[PDB]
Design a protein around this ligand. Structure first.
Ligand code: ZN
Ligand code: ZN
Lengths: 830, 99, 49, 49, 49, 49, 98
């Protein structure tokens, strides 16, 4: 009933908060020894529980709020990561974007992240990550004048082992993430460390000690931002990231008032840590690097940051992952043949706009929620069509470029003598067996060129043969012999050169054949489409009610077919095939193709192979390298790795022999004590009522080799995943095989991953990377060209050093030297 | 759910508010909304009960003006139908509680 | 003997929180009601008029 | 409704409820807690609806 | 290294020179680091070294 | 810049108890007295009769 | 290498280091009847404890293409950690042995 009491209550309060809380002068007192650094953040999941059309509005409705708040509170600074969101805001509201870039120039509203979207770092291939950084940094350098030095990735469900190197290539030597505080098994050892990649490249990584990037500037948030720092001996500074994220507006203004009062408390009664608001994230990391002598003292983490959570994310939404890998490979082929056509042809302009839009629409569907399969049905009814459209447009672009080169499609009417095969792999695939028009197996061999494989009229030197021994089906070959039980389980996988069995059905728990299909009751704990739990393996059902039939016994590809009844409403048909070959290089192993009518509810269909290999670790393939996981469940850090992510092949080799499992749609593997288990299909229900119900085509090959993991396995994986398009010569005057223009002659572990045209100039960008782990040397052979120079550029294609290019008879043979797991990039100026 | 509504809001402050240096418009429908001015410039968002106040920008308190609210019928995390990670509710009717 | 000489299948140590919270879903009538105990309770419930 | 409840299912429900309480309540160093947890785990692994 | 296995056990009380006290008898079972697998600890009492 | 691109020397996280008890021996006049501070205290002590 | 050491230091640890230009994630030491692969990265607390390991005759450190071994006939303690192999030669303890 009296309003002067309010003011004298405020005066009574000023004995605890101080006199400056009403203005922005609280942050000017004691701004030297600051422990908690506060920054405003607005994490908007591009498509998590709402379509993209809703985020197009969430972006503006949050950022305009932030503009007005930054207008009211002068000390407040704001960060937002994705550049795609900036593009959407400029497409919808151009004037709001003009005011936004005005704020950006005024040192508020810091654009951070330097990537296109906040992508997942496990599933997309390495070139996808490099494209993320390329597109994001080019957008930021174009619109604003900033090049982000801080990789912002607080919501990703697991980090690959090569991310620090990719960051160092694209100019970003910092890293910020928060998700690794959700480890329900192993609290991460540090909070500010040096994340060292597979090869040695390092980024100064920091995790906000408060386990949320959506803090509330409370007293306990400000406290935990320094007091929960897991390694305080190295550096006493934690970042406070306050806001309301996961698809919502940023920090409310009352959070800024609570921050002012927290700083006032720290000034007057010094218990709360000294919050500092007028500092960005780059200044924060610069302080961290200054106080630790350029990070030379902080702990190191060498390799993969394993996120011990959201492990079913590798297997859920299987069709989207299949489409993503097909689209990545098709984009590789598209810009490869487009680079060739723009190089050689005279009136063909490299499709920069078409390929740029295709890459944008591919990277959009690599969001850390869309790709790992953690969205609602509408998000996927939006993402599968745009992804299929990207695939179709990439095929159309490839065909336009190819026809400009002098070829055309197979059309199923040209004679078998006039059929060719486009390779696009940077080495000579000795032979490829493929169907043309009527499941007709045709073999394509190329003894001379690595680009175009001609058909083979002569028979095979080493043909396959599917016959039947006593109630058993034998796919015999020159190399392997697959003895298959009458119920589908491979009773034996014998190697004919090295006379040894590769199964070990006696020991271990798996006692009945390899290629065993198992249905695990999934039933995760909390998040159904995200998580799969370690206790899901105790409840299982083995599918042993199949029936085997000899599908084909021809010389090119022997194959049996097993009709396995999964349950009622669910069925599967596994084709087990062994191909013939001329050279051992051509062989890809025992192929398996599952046609799964999948309708089970909360089930996990996996396939197991006991492999008679006794090693202590298994080599899986990740972006631009090889990650070696344990196989023994020794410590809690190994019990968390009961299912891991792998790109194309999972290897398991002892000193003398080894077994790889290659695939082209699956991403989750588990090797643990002689038993390799590939996770085929999940059936979650919580965010998606019908997640993977339907028909699925799952291809995977068991490729046994007679040495530790060699380049032969990498090449067999790339061949298994590649798409071989049937060509036909259009003109006998331009049908020349120029696809051998860019070669990489040297050690076979050095893969010429990607060929591209420059983002700005007319030079050819070659992404090379050693894939197995040894400092190697090679030679870029540029045959049918006149090379003005060959420089070594970084990921964003700025030159660093100029290579000394030789000059042979007609080619050039640039000599290159790659480190342990280096990802080098070469700009060839013609 | 996901249905959009457009509220043209026409306000007239009482004259006695020549005082009251700050005037607020409160909007607390359980969903998202975004204030547009007469020209289409977004000014402030409403997100459930955690963000309601919209300060009238010291310019259209003197003269009775109008703005617009593009209210989207969904929570901050979609619709849910039982929980946040549950499949969205095709029918979730929101109630306007404060204007 | 009964103790096998070769142990080619590693067994991990059960994490406390995970295997503790797993028991919550055996009697829960929530999302996994049809795979757990609160599905064999009824034995042909009848409520038709 | 007019139910005809599964008596052994209800008995198992009460058993599992008591054991899950023993798991949630007993101190982190009492072997009865872990014996109850092991028995609950085996029950969940054994039960097929 | 090759796969051969031995059933290893460590007396939970961290001494092979226990004193058969009350706290020794207690720790021999209550300090068992994995009680979910087997609830049995060995008490090795004496004065060694 | 000052931040090196290649980190070929790993740094471990300091264990709490070890590096905490290490400080006890800098001022201790015990076994490592000659390597620590209680050796530059004296500056030519004299006690001869 | 053959060191003739007149050793009289007190509480000192003479070791010898070789940076080897090998970038692998593990090092293979030799133990009784086999090869034990230790980490080289100090990632977890189980690796900070292995800052010096036992090896019988040779400590290997090899990437996919090249490798360096360190063989010996009297020493048993080795430490490979990030391109730096360090063989522990001589300790000078004093407490049970003056
Ligand atoms: Zn998110
Ligand atoms: Zn002794």
């Amino acid at each position: 009933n009296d309003l002067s009491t309010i003011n004298e209550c405020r005066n009574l309060a000023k004995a605890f908060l101080g006199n400056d809380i009403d203005s922005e002068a609280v942050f000017e007192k004691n701004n030297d020894k600051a422990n908690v650094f506060a920054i405003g953040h607005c994490h908007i999941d591009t498509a998590w529980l709402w379509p993209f059309a809703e985020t197009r509005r969430k972006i503006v409705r949050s950022w305009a709020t932030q503009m007005n708040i930054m207008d009211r509170y002068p000390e407040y600074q704001f960060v937002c990561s994705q550049a795609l969101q900036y593009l959407w805001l400029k497409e919808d509201h151009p004037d709001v974007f003009e005011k936004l870039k005005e704020y950006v120039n005024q040192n508020k509203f810091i654009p951070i992240g330097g990537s296109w979207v906040e992508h997942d770092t496990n599933i997309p291939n390495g070139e996808s990550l490099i494209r993320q950084f390329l597109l994001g940094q080019h957008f930021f350098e174009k619109e604003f004048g900033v090049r982000c030095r801080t990789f912002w990735l607080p919501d990703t469900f697991g980090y690959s082992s090569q991310i620090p190197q990719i960051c160092r290539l694209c100019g970003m030597d910092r890293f910020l993430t928060q998700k690794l505080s959700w480890n329900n098994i192993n609290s991460f050892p540090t909070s500010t460390f040096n994340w060292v990649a597979l090869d040695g490249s390092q980024v100064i990584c920091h995790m906000p000690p408060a386990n949320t990037y959506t803090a509330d500037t409370n007293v306990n948030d400000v406290l935990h931002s320094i007091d929960q720092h897991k390694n305080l001996v190295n550096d006493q500074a934690g970042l406070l990231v306050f806001g309301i994220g996961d698809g919502g507006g940023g920090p409310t203004p009352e959070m800024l008032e609570k921050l002012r009062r927290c700083k006032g408390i720290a000034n007057t009664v010094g218990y709360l840590p000294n919050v500092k608001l007028g500092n960005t994230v780059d200044e924060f990391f610069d302080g961290i690097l200054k106080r630790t002598n350029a990070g030379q003292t902080l702990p190191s983490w060498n390799g993969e940051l394993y996120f011990e959570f959201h492990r079913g994310t590798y297997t859920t939404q299987a069709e989207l992952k299949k489409l993503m890998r097909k689209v990545e490979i098709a984009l590789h082929d598209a810009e490869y043949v487009s680079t060739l056509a723009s190089i050689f042809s005279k009136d063909y302009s490299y499709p920069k706009e078409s390929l740029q839009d295709l890459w944008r629409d591919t990277l959009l569907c690599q969001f850390h929620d869309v790709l790992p399969g953690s969205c609602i049905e509408m998000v996927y009814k939006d993402a599968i069509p745009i992804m299929s459209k990207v695939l179709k447009n990439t095929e159309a672009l490839l065909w336009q470029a190819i026809e400009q080169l002098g070829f055309k499609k197979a059309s199923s009417s040209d004679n078998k003598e006039q059929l060719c095969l486009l390779n696009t792999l940077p080495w000579n695939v000795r032979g490829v067996i493929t169907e043309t028009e009527e499941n007709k197996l045709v073999y394509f061999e190329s003894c001379d060129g690595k680009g175009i494989l001609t058909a083979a009229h002569t028979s095979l030197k080493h043909p396959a043969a599917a016959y039947q021994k006593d109630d058993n089906f034998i796919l015999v070959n020159d190399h392997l012999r697959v003895t298959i039980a009458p119920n589908g389980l491979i009773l034996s996988l014998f190697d004919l050169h090295k006379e040894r069995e590769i199964l070990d059905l006696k020991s271990g728990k798996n006692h009945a054949g390899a290629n065993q299909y198992v249905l695990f009751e999934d039933t995760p704990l909390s998040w159904q489409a995200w998580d799969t739990e370690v206790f899901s393996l105790e409840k299982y059902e083995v599918l042993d009610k199949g029936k085997v039939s000899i599908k084909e016994s021809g010389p090119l590809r022997a194959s049996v077919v097993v009709d396995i009844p999964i349950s009622e409403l669910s069925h599967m048909k596994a084709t087990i095939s062994l191909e013939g070959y001329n050279d051992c290089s051509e062989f890809t192993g025992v192929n398996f193709t599952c046609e799964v009518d999948w309708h089970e509810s909360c089930k996990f269909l996996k396939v197991e192979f006991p492999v008679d290999i006794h090693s202590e670790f298994a080599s899986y393939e990740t972006q631009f390298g090889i990650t070696k996981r344990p196989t023994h469940y020794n410590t809690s850090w190994d019990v968390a790795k009961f299912e891991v992510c792998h790109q194309k092949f999972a290897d398991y080799s002892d000193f003398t022999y080894g077994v790889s499992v290659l695939n082209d749609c699956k991403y989750g593997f588990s090797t643990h004590g002689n038993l390799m288990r590939l996770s085929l299909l999940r059936s979650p229900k919580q965010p998606d009522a019908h997640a993977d119900m339907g028909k699925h085509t799952i291809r995977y090959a068991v490729y046994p080799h007679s040495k530790p993991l060699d380049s032969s396995t990498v090449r067999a994986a790339h061949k298994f995943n590649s798409n071989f398009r049937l060509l036909t010569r259009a003109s006998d005057t331009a049908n020349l095989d120029i696809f051998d223009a860019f070669q990489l002659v040297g050690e076979p572990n050095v893969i010429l991953s990607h060929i591209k045209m420059a983002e700005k100039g007319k030079s050819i960008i070659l992404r090379v990377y050693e894939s197995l782990g040894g400092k190697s040397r090679a030679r870029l052979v540029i045959k049918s060209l006149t090379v003005a120079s060959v420089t070594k550029c970084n990921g964003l294609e700025e030159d660093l050093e100029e290579l000394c290019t030789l000059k042979s008879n007609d080619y050039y043979e640039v000599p290159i030297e790659l480190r342990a797991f280096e990802i080098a990039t070469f700009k060839v100026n013609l | 759910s996901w249905a959009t509504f457009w509220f043209e809001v026409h306000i007239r402050l009482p004259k006695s508010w020549a005082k009251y240096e700050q005037v607020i418009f409160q909007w607390n429908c359980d969903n998202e909304g975004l204030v547009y001015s007469q020209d289409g410039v977004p000014l402030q968002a409403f997100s459930g009960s955690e963000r309601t106040d919209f300060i009238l920008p010291d310019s259209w308190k003197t003269t009775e003006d109008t703005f617009y609210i593009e209210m989207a019928c969904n929570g901050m995390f979609g619709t849910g139908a039982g929980s946040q990670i549950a499949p969205p509710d095709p029918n979730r009717y929101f109630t306007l509680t404060k204007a | 003997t009964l103790f096998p000489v070769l142990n080619n299948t590693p067994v991990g140590k059960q994490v406390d929180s995970i295997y503790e919270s797993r028991l919550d879903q055996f009697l829960s009538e929530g999302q996994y009601r049809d795979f757990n105990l609160p599905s064999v309770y009824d034995h042909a419930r009848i409520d038709n008029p | 409704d007019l139910v005809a409840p599964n008596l052994p299912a209800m008995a198992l429900a009460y058993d599992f409820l008591l054991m899950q309480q023993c798991v949630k309540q007993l101190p982190s160093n009492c072997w009865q807690k872990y014996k109850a947890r092991q028995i609950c785990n085996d029950i969940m692994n054994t039960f097929h609806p």
